[PDB]
Write a protein that binds this ligand. Structure first.
Ligand SMILES: OC[C@H]1O[C@H](O)[C@@H](O)[C@@H](O)[C@@H]1O
Ligand SMILES: OC[C@H]1O[C@H](O)[C@@H](O)[C@@H](O)[C@@H]1O
Ligand SMILES: OC[C@H]1O[C@H](O)[C@@H](O)[C@@H](O)[C@@H]1O
Ligand SMILES: OC[C@H]1O[C@H](O)[C@@H](O)[C@@H](O)[C@@H]1O
Ligand SMILES: OC[C@H]1O[C@H](O)[C@@H](O)[C@@H](O)[C@@H]1O
Ligand SMILES: OC[C@H]1O[C@H](O)[C@@H](O)[C@@H](O)[C@@H]1O
Lengths: 121, 121
């Protein structure tokens, strides 16, 4: 059962554990790089890194996928865009009016799958 | 509404967006360092870094807290441990039989709070 719990007091300034995203891409996503950590293969070309600002999060995203992740694009609450990166295969699915909390997945030579954890608004 | 969606196919090896954790601790948690990104102050002492392997997640975690986070310890599904680090103040709460997905929080000179996103089994 997916949930969250807060521990501690009321001070400080908020932070998120998710800080940056890059990809390697060609016809597919070869890799995703999350907070600098590489997952996937060495093919394709490395995108610039998208670093989330304070209070910035993915609010909408389009993923093309099939057996692998073919393409990713996203936009943040600040209106900044990442991608599209990747190819034209697969089929498209979109998340809208969300707040992405985390990205897990599975990878080998390519990025096989993504598990997106998000709040739906 | 907190939710998960998977995109892509069945192959590859699993990874998590949450790759590494360290803390600065003394009496309290001065800071938490998530995937290399520092959240909190410069006091206390830096712990070693715990780096998750493929398929590995936090399965049990004990947090002591009051106004701030006093202490953290955790266990993974692979029988590995982190901590305890911090002091004996506050009161303890334990998450048991979980899969941690993300660690967010709030920080200033110390780690005021943690907002742990997880699956509860
Ligand atoms: O993205 C998959 C594949 O697409 C293309 O064929 C090239 O860009 C390769 O380098 C890459 O590995
Ligand atoms: O995801 C890679 C690939 O997987 C399958 O072969 C199909 O869904 C393709 O359209 C897609 O491009
Ligand atoms: O990522 C594409 C592909 O790469 C390798 O061949 C293995 O890791 C497979 O399991 C994976 O599906
Ligand atoms: O952890 C809070 C505080 O605890 C102690 O007083 C010392 O270890 C300090 O360096 C640290 O800042
Ligand atoms: O969390 C820091 C500190 O907050 C309060 O002063 C009390 O809850 C203490 O027991 C705890 O050590
Ligand atoms: O982290 C402890 C403390 O540090 C600062 O003084 C501010 O950021 C406070 O809001 C916070 O409670």
């Amino acid at each position: 059962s997916l949930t969250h719990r807060k521990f501690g007091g009321s001070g400080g300034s908020p932070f998120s554990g998710l800080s940056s995203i890059a990809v390697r891409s060609g016809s597919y996503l070869d890799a995703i790089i999350i907070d600098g950590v590489h997952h996937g293969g060495s093919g394709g070309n490395l995108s610039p890194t998208f670093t989330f600002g304070s209070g910035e999060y993915i609010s909408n995203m389009t993923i093309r996928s099939g057996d692998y992740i073919d393409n990713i694009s996203f936009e943040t609450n600040m209106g900044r865009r990442f991608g599209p990166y990747g190819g034209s295969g697969g089929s498209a699915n979109t998340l809208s009016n969300v707040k992405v909390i985390q990205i897990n997945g599975s990878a080998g030579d390519y990025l096989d799958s993504l598990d997106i954890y998000y709040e739906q608004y």
